[PDB]
Amino acid sequence: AKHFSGLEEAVYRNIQACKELAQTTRTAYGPNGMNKMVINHLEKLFVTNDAATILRELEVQHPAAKMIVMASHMQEQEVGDGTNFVLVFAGALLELAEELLRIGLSVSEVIEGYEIACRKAHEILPNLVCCSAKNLRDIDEVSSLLRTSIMSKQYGNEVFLAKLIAQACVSIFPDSGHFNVDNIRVCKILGSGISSSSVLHGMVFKKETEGDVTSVKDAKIAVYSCPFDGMITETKGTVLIKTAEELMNFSKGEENLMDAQVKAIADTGANVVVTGGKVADMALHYANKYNIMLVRLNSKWDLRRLCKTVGATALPRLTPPVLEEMGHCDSVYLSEVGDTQVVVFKHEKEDGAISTIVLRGSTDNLMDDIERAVDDGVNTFKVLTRDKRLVPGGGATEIELAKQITSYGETCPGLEQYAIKKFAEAFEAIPRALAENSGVKANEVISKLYAVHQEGNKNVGLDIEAEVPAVKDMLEAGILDTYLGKYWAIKLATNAAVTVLRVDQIIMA
Amino acid sequence: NTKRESGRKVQSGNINAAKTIADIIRTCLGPKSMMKMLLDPMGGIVMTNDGNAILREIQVQHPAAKSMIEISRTQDEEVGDGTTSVIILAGEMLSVAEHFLEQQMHPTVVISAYRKALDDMISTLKKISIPVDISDSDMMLNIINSSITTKAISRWSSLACNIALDAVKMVQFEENGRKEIDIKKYARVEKIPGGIIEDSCVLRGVMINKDVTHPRMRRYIKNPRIVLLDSSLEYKKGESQTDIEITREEDFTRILQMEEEYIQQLCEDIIQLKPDVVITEKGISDLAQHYLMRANITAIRRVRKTDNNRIARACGARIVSRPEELREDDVGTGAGLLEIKKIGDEYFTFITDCKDPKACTILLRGASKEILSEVERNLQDAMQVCRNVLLDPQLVPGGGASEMAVAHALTEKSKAMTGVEQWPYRAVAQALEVIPRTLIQNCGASTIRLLTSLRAKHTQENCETWGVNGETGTLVDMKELGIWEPLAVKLQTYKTAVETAVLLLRIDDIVSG
Amino acid sequence: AEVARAQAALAVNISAARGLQDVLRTNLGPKGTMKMLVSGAGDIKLTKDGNVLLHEMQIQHPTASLIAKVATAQDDITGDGTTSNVLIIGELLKQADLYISEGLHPRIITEGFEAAKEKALQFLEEVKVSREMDRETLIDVARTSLRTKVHAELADVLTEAVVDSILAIKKQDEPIDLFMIEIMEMKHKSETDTSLIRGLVLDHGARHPDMKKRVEDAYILTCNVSLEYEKTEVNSGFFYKSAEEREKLVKAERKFIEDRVKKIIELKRKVCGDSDKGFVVINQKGIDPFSLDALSKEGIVALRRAKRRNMERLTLACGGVALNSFDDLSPDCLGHAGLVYEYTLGEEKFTFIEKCNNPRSVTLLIKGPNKHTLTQIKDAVRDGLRAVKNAIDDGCVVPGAGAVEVAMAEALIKHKPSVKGRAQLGVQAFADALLIIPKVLAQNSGFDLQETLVKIQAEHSESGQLVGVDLNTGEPMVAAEVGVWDNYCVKKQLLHSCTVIATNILLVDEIMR
């Protein structure tokens, strides 16, 4: 399963991973991505562009492959751009060893080689970072920067999500100029159009919402997974469905039990009583007349979405909520979020870091697609908060790096002269991967990319003009990268590549 | 049921096991050494110089090996040593004799050779067996350290010398019949845990670990007088057997506690008497034993009468109904030393006893609780000399030149005894010389030429006293080299060895039951 | 039954051992690599350390049992060179096997190892000098100690922090540091990062803005039994069995809650003054909801979840004592470290207790999001701390980088064993086992493990040169001048642990399945 001897772990398990590293990025990355089906532990189809997601979706056997998986999620979280890339470069980097193994170089040698070279490459990145753009009050500025940032992991409507994913992150923080891990909730709601996905700041319970509104103005929520059907976890009051007379007497008390329920809720207070559990009509007919808002049988996700944002703890047991157990929202106003009638809260002044964007695709994988793309749009704005520093689309940068690193390789001398010169080569897998997705060869791209000799701006994008593979200034083209997005990508890819190289066999009975 | 086995087939199976067993340990035995490492099915390694330790951990084959463990024990049962000798020695005579001799065809002189090959040992040994002073610790120490080294250990030897040099002389039975050769209850070695080599503190008499087990007990009363029962403990071992009641939950708890609250009232009956020690063969409970200790009365519990009796004679303890009620007191002092040694708060009461029934249970202290086990083996191998030297001052020096001494005197006598008999007697003449020659083949070079030199040395220079060095391989006087091969041991070895090999020939047949 | 014996039996042993060791040649020094180990947990375990790898997951071997002792032993007695020992012994066996392949007795090959080791021992006693215990002189060793065990880049970033901890000693006599190891770990944005903290840090605190963010005069009340109880070093019994008992259970617990938090707040006023100093409550268990914010707003800092190891280090470090309880008591008993600072890094709240009355406890906060990295670096700190301490405990340090191994091999110059030629092989086999580390590095480096090594010797034989293979480029250089130094206690201990098992190898010629 795992343990092997006879050089199976190194020249074999490692390189096989590099095979997996391909076509999770190769056509799935570039200025655009491409989709690859995913069937699930409970079976259903997921199309995916970005590496980390689908490879997290893949339970992986190889400890070799297993290690770099971690770095891509570190990237995706930290960066999101080149999350596909962290595979390909590391793979193209690690595949350089076997020949050096036939050349006879040492792991202790070649790790140092790529190391000082990525430490050299990290030095070179700032200059191949080309100009900058930041306005975090500007959706349209953030849009185009997220547009290619989502586009790199998105083949779809790029500017609309870019608009929306820039809409929220700009408008969800009044202080934008900072960004936090989850600043955007999404209530995935199918139907209508893909443009029917819409940005609404503040918590959306996509759930059925009942109770007659006492205050749409304030939303203070005593938050519950507690069933208000009359069922409290510690000792349940569960309805008796096996007898007509027992149900006759209980429902008459479910009015007044829910009375003792809604009160302990609304004693310490609630505007919405957020209900993750079941509700009874006599509980609701009362809660209608009692006028507290039951958002009923709420999705644990909607519950978690609420439990996170309002800073309150859902109560499984029925019990008076204290200030930790009650959430607060700007407003509770029943409204269609993407033309789907639900309850949508508002959070901008409340806390922030929650913009609930209804994702409306035509199919759930489209509703996964728009879900996939913003993952970078989330993080790239976070990158865009961390730097406006702008790099053109990939493949323009890596050639100058190779130009650096190869001559930086002959300035090595000692066997790392090979390794560093190899480190220059793992750069060229991207325009290849891009030439692959677009259906051409790197060699022409490489020839063209070296032809102009510019190095960090002009490149073949992911292109229909790639019919004949064709360079373009990536900076001006709007297909763009960032220092961090490029820097972290090299830093984590080389790391995960060089650390999997030092590993040895596992002696095991 | 009925099962039949026949001829060489079983006797060859007899040849196999013991001989194959005789391989590693012969290399192990003596200063020249190896290790027999058992492979447990899990890969577990057990390496010893005792094959009988290895033999048990795995299947013991019936034909040879089932009897060899017992002739392994018997030798170690007797003198306290020699599991590893008899097996290879019996393996010797087992190996080359029968088939050869049965190809010369007869079971008889084969069996008969064991006798007359056995006594030539008895004959040539006690002639060349060198006497040593039994009153001299040292003259015993050089023969005792030779026999404390049975495998690797000269380490505790000098320390196991001193204790045994002292102890076995004081050894007497409860009959006190003779001193000397003894049962290991009349010389006991109880390893006492912990401490350090300084606490080894030679103990010539019995020890009672149960005399003082507690700090609250009797503290160093020079002559402990153990008062047996009889009134001080009036006899109730029984129980009230009180009737059942459902109301009180305590009745369930109290009825079982009643058992040990009787001796409590009996220990209360002891307190009034203040026996400095109290011995109870019925045993005393600990809830009863509280009230003895606080009196500064120590309590020996769950010990038998003979344990106490030998001690009551050894510690010189008046054995009475009550101290104030005359059962005709025994003496006040039988011993000159009562030493209660403490490692932790569990006290070890050692009473050094001079020519008393006692047990002669000797104190040893290793650097810790562990190397004790070798000191005990060292002491037992040490006390073995001290019981052997106090038996035989004459014990043969040899590096196995004794193991030659018989062998060559046999071939000498083979020429004398003649008949067809000589040929077994000359065949069994060969088996003895292999053990040391192996040890000096463990040395190297030509070990048979050394043996030739041995044989050249043998009748020319000397049989055994002058001989070959075992670990060096040089021909040297083995008293001059200081290597001692106890007469009794050697006397026991072939004897025990010739016996088993007699039956191994006599058995061509086993059944299934 | 089934018995493997003599020459062919020991083959699988020496085939295993030499076959098992050669995989560790990927280790021992920066040109060697961390070896990946995986278990049933699937944990990728990256260590160039022999012990870590050796005792976890391996292939079944009879030698696999014995080797697990020595790399443990050298880790025990040092914390370094556990990878070293393994490669010497089979190199000696490979040597030894030749002579046994020559037929020359494993006994005669065994008995020649010991003088040779003593020779090198005496020689390593000669090539040692008393060096500094100076931090920089420790850097010379710390650089060297870590690299032959853990990674060099790790070694470098560890070299300063590793020494600083073992430099924090009061001049302890300990060869390894018990409380200088306090390992905090974290999920970070750096898969490998280690902060150097003298004093003790808490597992968890509880940080509130109500609680003082900075406690400068810190009277630390460190308690197991927590706020839920009342004047108790022991928890109080619950009965949920029946209604009326539980009905009275939940009402009075707040009294246990109230008095407890009261016990602190009145005691802070007592102990720390009102707002005058900061107070520190440690709750080794949970913190009460009332008492949490109640201790918070009184200036008290209540700390959720400090360990029992935080308990003991604090008392030692801050000179105070941890309680079980919050009751009114003097400030001195309550732990006082001249700073209590709760440093929340990652999701984990690390409460520093710093400016400690004893800088015996000192802490290192390890970092990584990836566990295998968090495994490596957190493991990478310890060996040096144990290793480099052997530099700062010992006035002597043996020079490293294998310069001393070429030094003895010729200093073992032969017919010095003119004795027999078995010791002459025992030295000749041993002279080559010395060089396996100077080999394996130049091996793991460029060029030749030999061509350089013979350069080294040809060089070292030249006067004034104690010269050795570089741990990096594998080129000849004088090792003592680079400062590259393995701990003194390593070698002398290493040689013993090296020779014994290889010595134990030849004494086992038998294995029984």
Best residue of A72, A504, A508 to probe chain C, by most C CBs closer than 10 Å: A504
- Neighbouring-strand partners of residue C486: C398
SS3 sequence of C70-105: HHHHHHHHCCCCHHHHHHHHHHHHHHHHHHHHCCCC
> Which among B27, B48, B74, B83 is annotated as catalytic?
B83
B20 and C5: CB-CB below 8 Å?
Answer: yes
How far is the C-alpha of A482 from the C-alpha of A380, rounded, in Å? 8
CB C296 within 8 A of CB C210: yes
CB of A493 within 8 A of CB of A90? yes
**B242 labelled ligand-binding:** no
Beta bridge partners of B418: none
Query: Longest Cα pair distance anywhere in chain B, in angstroms?
Result: 97
Which strands form C214-215's sheet, in the order they lie side by side? C200-201, C348-354, C339-345, C214-215
Buried b (16+ CB within 10 A) or exposed e, A95-129: bbbeebeeeebbbbbbbbbbbbbbebbbebbeebb
- Sequence-ordered list of residues with C-beta below 8 angstroms from that of B502, at least 6 positions apart, any chain: B111, B114
**Quick one: which H or E segment has residue C419?**
none
Mutate to test the interface with A, among C44, C67, C472 (most CBs of A within 10 A): C44
Do A2 and A503 meet the contact criterion of CB atoms below 8 Å apart? no
Cα separations in angstroms, A377 against A119, A158, B278: 28, 11, 90
Q: Which of B26, B28, B39 is the best substitution to test chain C (most C C-beta atoms within 10 A)?
A: B39
d(CA A320, CA A334): 26
N residues, chain B: 513
Angle between the N-to-C axes of helices B422-431 and B401-417, in degrees from 0 to 180, rounded to the nearest 10: 170
Helix (H) or strand (E) holding C482: helix C479-482
Residue of C nearest to B25 (CA): C510
Is the Cβ–Cβ distance between C206 and C379 less than 8 Å? no
Q: How far apart are CA B284 and CA B261, in angstroms?
A: 10
CB-CB under 8 Å, A506 with C37: yes
The answer to whether the Cβ–Cβ distance between C46 and A502 falls below 8 Å is yes
Q: What are the backbone angles phi and psi of residue B8, rounded to the nearest 5°?
A: -50, -35
Give C-chain residues touching A108 at CB under 8 angstroms: 30-33, 444
Find the chain B residues whose C-beta atoms sit closer than 8 A to any C-beta of C: 20, 23-24, 27, 32-39, 41-45, 47, 54, 58-59, 61, 442-444
Helix, strand, coil fractions of chain B, as percent rounded to 5 = 50, 10, 40
Query: Which of C419, C443, C451, C430 is CA-nearest to residue C495?
Result: C430
Rg of chain B on CA atoms, in Å: 28
Strands B45-48 and A326-329: unpaired
Residues of C in contact with A63 (CB under 8 A): 36, 38, 42, 44
Q: Please enumerate in sequence order all residues whose Cβ is within 8 A of that of A508, keeping only pairs 6 or more positions apart, or say none.
A: A3, C38, C57, C58, C59
Cα distance between residue B447 and residue B437, in whole Å: 6
SS3 content of chain C, % helix, strand, coil (to 5): 50, 15, 35
Option in A78, A107, A508 nearest C189 (CB):
A78
- Is the CB of B39 less than 8 angstroms away from the CB of C507? no
B166/chain C closest Cα distance in angstroms:
35
Residue A67 in contact with residue C370, Cβ under 8 Å?
A: yes
Name the catalytic one among B74, B84, B298, B447. Answer: B84
For chain A, the farthest-separated pair of C-alpha atoms sits apart, in whole angstroms, at: 93
CA distance B195 to chain C (A): 23
Contact between residue C50 and residue C26 where contact means Cβ atoms under 8 Å apart: no
Pair of tokens at residue A245: 């007379």
Contact (CB, 8 A) for A110 and A501: yes
Of C23, C26, C57, the CB nearest to A3: C57
Distance from C445 to chain A by nearest Cα, in Å? 8
A201 has which bridge partners?
A355
Report which secondary-structure segment, H or E, holds C490: helix C488-507
Degrees, nearest 5: CA angle A376-C367-C43: 85
Do B390 and B179 contact (CB within 8 A), yes or no? yes
Number of Cβ within a 10 Å radius of residue C327: 18
Read off the tokens for B422. Answer: 């000589």
CB contact under 8 A, A107 and C30: no
Please report the sign of the dihedral spanned by the C-alpha atoms of residue C434, residue C438, residue C441, residue C447: negative
Q: Could you tell me which of B462, B337, B442, B459 has the C-alpha nearest to residue B408?
A: B459
Nearest to C17 by CA among C58, C67, C54: C67
Residue C375, SS3?
A: helix
The tokens describing C317, both together, are: 């470090």
Q: Name the DSSP letter for residue A428.
A: G
Whole-angstrom Cα distance, residue C372 to residue A13? 18
Q: Tell me whether residues C105 and B47 touch, CB distance under 8 A.
A: no
Contact B129, B120 (CB under 8 A): no
C278 and C299 in contact (C-beta within 8 Å)?
A: yes
**Could you identify the residue written with the tokens 């789907």?**
A340
C59 shares contact with chain B (CB less than 8 Å):
no
Could you tell me how many residues make up chain A? 509
Q: Which chains have 3+ CB pairs within 8 A of B?
A: C
User: What 3-state DSSP class applies to A303?
Assistant: helix
Q: Tell me: is residue A381 an annotated ligand-binding position.
A: no
C332 flagged as catalytic: no
Please work out, in degrees rounded to the nearest 5, the angle formed at the alpha carbon of residue C137 by the alpha carbons of C131 and C143: 125
**Nearest-angstrom CA–CA distance, A454 and A467:** 21
Q: Are B102 and B508 in contact (CB under 8 A)?
A: no
CB C356 within 8 A of CB C109: no
User: Does residue A155 sit in helix, strand or coil?
Assistant: coil
- The backbone region for A6, taken as left when phi is positive above 0, alpha when psi lies in -120 to 50, beta otherwise, is left
Contact assessment for residue A118 and residue A419, using Cβ atoms and an 8 Å cutoff:
no
- Residue partners of C489: CB distance under 8 A and separation at least 6: C77, C78, C175, C390, C393, C394
Helical residues (DSSP H) of C239-338, grouped into ranges: 243-247, 249-271, 289-297, 308-318
The span from the CA of B267 to the CA of B261, in Å, is: 9
Optimal mutation site among B24, B52, B60, interface C, most CBs of chain C within 10 A: B24
Cβ distance C5 to B23 less than 8 Å, yes or no, reads yes
CB C337 within 8 A of CB C326: no
Alpha-carbon distance of C92 to C14, in angstroms, equals: 10
Report whether C265 contacts C298 (CB < 8 A): yes
B48 is an active site residue? no
Residue C81: name the closest of C36, C148, C133 by CA. Answer: C148
Measure the CA–CA gap between C87 and A422, rounded to whole angstroms: 33
Closest residue of chain B to C7, computed from CA coordinates? B24
Distance from A320 to chain C by nearest Cα, in Å?
15
Copy the structure tokens of residue A240: 């008796």
Helices B83-96 and B7-28, packing angle to 10 deg: 140
Helix (H, G, I), strand (E, B) or coil at C385: helix
Beta bridge partners of C193: C367
How many angstroms from the chain centroid is the CA of residue C295?
A: 39
**CB-CB under 8 Å, A506 with C36:** yes
Of B497, B490, B460, nearest to B400 (Cα)?
Answer: B490
C250 touching chain B per CB within 8 A: no
DSSP string computed for B44-73: -EEEES-HHHHHHTS---TTTHHHHHHHHH
What is the C-alpha to C-alpha distance for residues C397 and C407, in angstroms, rounded to an integer?
16
Cα separation, C391 vs A358, in Å, equals: 65
Distance CA B460, CA B438 (A): 22
Resolution of the structure, angstroms: 8.2
Answer whether B52's CB lies under 8 Å from B459's CB. Answer: no
Contact assignment for B35 to C513 by CB distance below 8 Å:
no
Nearest to C507 among B20, B34, B41 (CB): B34
Q: Would you call A460 helix, strand, or coil by DSSP? A: coil
Residue C105 forms contact with B (CB below 8 Å): yes
CB contact under 8 A, B45 and C66: yes
Q: Give me the amino acid identity at C156.
A: D
Cβ contact C507–B35 (<8 Å): yes
> What is the distance between the alpha carbons of residues A394 and B439, in angstroms, rounded to a whole number?
79
Is C22 part of the annotated catalytic residue set? no
Against chain C, the chains showing at least 3 CB pairs within 8 Å are A, B
> Cα separation of A117 and A35, whole Å?
33
State the Cα–Cα distance between residues C488 and C386, nearest whole angstrom.
12
Cα-based angle C39, C45, C51 (whole degrees, multiple of 5): 95
Q: How many other β-carbons are positioned within 10 Å of the β-carbon of residue C248?
A: 11
A281 sits in which H/E element: helix A281-290
C422 near B CB under 8 A: yes
Catalytic residue among C47, C78, C82, C110: C82
Q: DSSP readout, A186-253?
A: --B--SS-STT-EEEES-EE-S-EES--S-SS-EEEEEE---BSS--SSS------S-HHHHHHHHHH
Q: Is C259 on the interface with B (CB under 8 A)?
A: no
Give the residue from B148, B113, B317, B310 showing the smallest Cα distance to B218: B317
For residue A77, what is the nearest residue in chain C, using CA coordinates?
C189
DSSP string, C102-163: TT--HHHHHTTHHHHHHHHHHHHHHH-EE----HHHHHHHHHHHHHHHS-HHHHHHHHHHHH
Task: Report the distance separating Cα A470 and Cα A176, nearest Å.
Answer: 37
Q: Could you confirm whether B330 is annotated as catalytic?
A: no
Put simply, the answer to whether B20 touches C3 (Cβ < 8 Å) is yes
* Burial classification of residue B220, based on how many CB atoms lie within 10 Å of its CB (0-12 exposed, 13-18 middle, 19 or more buried): exposed
Cβ-contact A504, C26 below 8 angstroms: yes
Strand partners, B64: none
DSSP states of B99-164: HHHHHS--SHHHHHHHHHHHHHHHHHHHHHPBP--SS-HHHHHHHHHHHH-SSS--TTHHHHHHHH
HSE of A287 in the Cβ direction (CA atoms, 13 Å)? 33
Is B259 in a helix, a strand, or coil? helix
Alpha helices (H) along B171-300: 250-271, 286-293
SS3 A333: strand
CB–CB contact C512 B442 (8 Å):
no
Q: Which chain A residues are within 8 Å of C373, Cβ to Cβ?
A: 499
Report the gap between the CA of C111 and the closest CA in chain A (Å): 33
Q: Do residues A40 and A476 lie in contact, with contact meaning Cβ atoms separated by under 8 Å?
A: no
- Report CA-CA distances (Å) from B141 to B161, B171, B482: 6, 17, 10
Q: Are A169 and A378 in contact (CB under 8 A)?
A: yes
Cα of A477 to nearest chain C Cα, Å? 33
Tokens of A176: 């934008």
Q: How far apart are the first and last CA of chain C?
A: 8
The reply to whether C148 sits in an annotated binding site is yes
Q: Is C245 exposed, middle or buried (0-12, 13-18, 19+ CB in 10 A)?
A: exposed
Residue with tokens 């995986």: C38
Residues of A with CB below 8 A from C444's CB? 106, 108
Look at residues C236, C215, C231, C225 and name the one whose alpha carbon lies nearest to residue C266: C231
> By the 8 A CB rule, do A85 and A489 touch?
yes
Confirm or deny that A85 is annotated as ligand binding.
yes
Element holding A478 (H helix, E strand)? none
What residues contact B493, with CB distance under 8 A and at least 6 apart? B75, B82, B85, B86, B89
- Numbers of helices and strands, H then E, in chain B: 17, 12
